[PDB]
Design a binder for this molecule. Structure first.
Ligand SMILES: [Cl-]
Ligand SMILES: [Cl-]
Ligand SMILES: [Zn+2]
Ligand SMILES: [Zn+2]
Lengths: 21, 30, 30, 21, 30, 21, 30, 21, 30, 21, 30, 21
């Protein structure tokens, strides 16, 4: 999930938009 | 833009920034 | 605990600490 | 809602807890 | 609620949240 | 102290109330 | 992305996330 | 400027990006 | 250093950075 | 007090330092 | 005052605190 | 640079003034 995508790995700001409602 | 490690409170701060009014879910179990 | 006055990103911080590994949803109006 | 309540008025951690998953 | 690791500025943010008006002490030497 | 209880180890929100005035 | 309302240190946070390892300059008026 | 705009009005991440090095 | 305008949790942040390992007390009015 | 001063007016880091232990 | 480790968003928060109105540059490549 | 002086190593608040404009 997010933690893996963005914390453990790295992510863009666009990826983080995946978790918007 | 860029890619960084975003963890914990820093991750939900980034979600807040990016999503804003749309709202978001932070669901670390997945 | 005490009552809170929380705007913007301070709300998200507070949700973060409160919910922990459960996570949360942030859903503002409009 | 909670987002607006906590800002325009006050809210509790117990009320916040309702937004946990 | 939950239990997490709360360190540095994150710890005093949590103390602020929890104590608020009561005030608090942050005394890392102990 | 606090650092050991809450950073090094983990603590609840109730434990953190131990450090309120 | 959504538009932002950012004061004080929230602006600097937002610049931080946006610019990453590129970094940024913070230059307020006066 | 940007510092004042984002606070008194609104700004975008794209506008923010202009302040990156 | 420059003068500061600090509310809420921003004050606690500023105390944190200023005091370091000495720590501090946060004691608002009432 | 300091908490109120820094918010309603301005304060210095030197004034802040008085609240260190 | 003190010396601590100041990293990432915490570093630019400290720069903001210290520099304020003067503005600052955060240039991690150097 | 800053990251080395202040994150990797440690720095004072006075050192951080080196990066003011
Ligand atoms: Cl951290
Ligand atoms: Cl604010
Ligand atoms: Zn704020
Ligand atoms: Zn942090």
């Amino acid at each position: 999930g997010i933690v893996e995508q963005c914390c453990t790995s790295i992510c863009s700001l666009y990826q983080l938009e995946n978790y918007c409602n | 833009f860029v890619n960084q490690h975003l963890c914990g409170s820093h991750l939900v701060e980034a979600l807040y920034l990016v999503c804003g009014e749309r709202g978001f879910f932070y669901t670390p179990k997945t």
